């Protein structure tokens, strides 16, 4: 509080309409480069226009205040007029310009605005997800480094704007979970996976099911009915007390009737593996509709399961190969030479017991690159980990550093340093 | 009392006032009826006492929070003076020139 | 001529005297409002300032004190040169930087930015180019040199 | 694995699916192991060295 | 995995809840 108190304290943090702009900038700079200059050039073009008719008012209130006689007797007067009518002739011809830049906010509007609502709710997504496991705490540059990734690295690059804006959509949802999930425990992927399904939801025709989410999140919070015992002929009272909670929801209103009347229905709903067939029903609904409705049901009556319907909720909604790639192996060599910055440091942090020194130095072996490994936890090692890091970045060596967890003191300016 | 003391050199006096039928006192044994110096001090004391409830509405939420200091209180009341001198003397320049310019295009 | 293309500029300046004895009514509440905002949502983020000044205003219509509700509160505090200079300067449009920009010219206590993206240390650098201004560290050993002679020669410092 | 006899790479399957058995099965504590040990990589790598030995 | 897979769906939903929630003794 002794500094809180002498200074002013000011905050450059990131909000969605700066984001949504910059976004729909670099979108613009990437897609159509000649219509992004001379968009530039008309916001130039009007600034100096808007900033010459604030001189004109200035030159004309100061003329007119000073003229220290009668107007009619002056030539001056005639000069300040002549110099109003070419202004007013400028002011005139602004109109055209002005009509292009309307053109222009018009088609990049209608063209690239969804793409733009769905960078803001992805980046704030990735921001907010620093709650959970206090580990991951993705920067601005991060998000620019995938659309680095996205936009200049294209596959299967085209030359249709139409097509090309969902493949770049596309494409953006899936290396931005990938990017993400790369560095995450495996029970958050299937939490970042369908957050971005929900991000994916958002921006599409499809129906916006803003109840039926919000009672999947807060139905066990939120208060059931006390003392009402349905009937126990083929469910637990855990169940019953799920289904009585779900009733409440306009589409699933005679829950308790269609349970009963469907009483062959013992094993689509109970036992056996239900994330596959499930019974029961929600006009012609959608299949994420579909999907969301199954997921309720399933959370309502099997929660075993719950996992599993979420990842085929993914899958239905984002694609069947979406999360397709954490399983398989971590190809760390494409990684690091292709996606890392050399000013980036790579942290592998690992759980106990499994170690990636060993990554590491395979690594080292098949690129056929040195590597001075040092074991942290001494102010010898701290010496040659210095001494090694300012080799490394005259030479152009790797350099490692190992158990790194063990002095954050010194990795204050480690960091510092390699800022 | 910092307030006022501070706020008062200047013409905060408004010959016409609606004193308000809700009232809304934050600092006790204010006058009855209160002038136009008296509620804006009054309103500075208000700024301040529900900045002290948002920052403890914010560290109740759980984001991280900061202190707030009277020399905040201080810098905002020498922000006020500051700013209503500048605005109230490039007003009356604007005006004046307009005034001119008046008389000038009626001439 | 004259009087057919001075017409309009006589529309405009008999409204805006008209409206000068409104204008001179809102001076109290809106350099109020205008002050707390600059001296107080200094620290936090774009929903928490619009609630401070939410508040603010709320109050200020409680006790019957009349304000523009109708201007930008950034509007009312910048003029359009200083925000092009501002914007030439490697400033970002938004709102909340042209408001951190305002902050950043009507400080009183000395500023201390948190910037993570490095774009005030930019903006500020870029606008102090025709004073001598000069960046150093706190880890730095040639710090208290640095901060002495800023002290003497009366150039900015930017720690 | 490629080296001879050919039966190493039958050797080296049945060696990784119980070392995927066995370090799956720790997942279920207790029921599938009683102490939460660690079957790390570094078993693996000796398996490996002696079963080639 | 009942017990596992429950829970599981159970820190989930918590998980998500607190992704949304931004968005005398």
Known sequence: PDLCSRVTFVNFTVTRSSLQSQCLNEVLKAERPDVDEKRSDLLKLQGEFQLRLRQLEKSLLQALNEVKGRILDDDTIITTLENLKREAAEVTRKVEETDIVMQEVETVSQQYLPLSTACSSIYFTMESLKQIHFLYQYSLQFFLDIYHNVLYENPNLVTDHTQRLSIITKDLFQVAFNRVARGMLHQDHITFAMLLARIKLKGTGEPTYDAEFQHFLRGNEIVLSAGSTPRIQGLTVEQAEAVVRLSCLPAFKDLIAKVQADEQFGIWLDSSSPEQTVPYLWTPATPIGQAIHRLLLIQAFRPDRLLAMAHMFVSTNLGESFMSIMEQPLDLTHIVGTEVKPNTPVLMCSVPGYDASGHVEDLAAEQNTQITSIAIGSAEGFNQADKAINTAVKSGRWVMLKNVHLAPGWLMQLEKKLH | ?107 | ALLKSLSAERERWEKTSETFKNQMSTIAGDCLLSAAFIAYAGYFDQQMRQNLFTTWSHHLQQANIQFRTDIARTEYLSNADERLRWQASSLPADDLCTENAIMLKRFNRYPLIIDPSGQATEFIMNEYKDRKITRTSFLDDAFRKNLESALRFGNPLLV | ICKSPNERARLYFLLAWFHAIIQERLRYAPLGWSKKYEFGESDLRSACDTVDT | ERVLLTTQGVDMISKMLKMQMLETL
């Open chain 2, 1 to 107: 009392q910092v307030g006022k003391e501070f706020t008062s050199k200047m013409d905060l006096e408004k010959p016409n006032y609606i004193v308000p039928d809700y009232m809304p006192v934050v600092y006790d044994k204010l006058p009855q009826p209160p002038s136009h110096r008296e509620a804006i001090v009054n309103s500075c004391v208000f700024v301040h006492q529900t900045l002290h409830q948002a920052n403890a509405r914010l560290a109740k939420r759980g984001g991280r929070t900061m202190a707030i200091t009277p020399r905040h209180y201080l810098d905002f009341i020498n922000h006020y003076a500051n700013l209503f001198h500048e605005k109230r003397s490039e007003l009356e320049e604007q005006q004046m020139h307009l005034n001119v310019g008046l008389r000038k295009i009626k001439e």
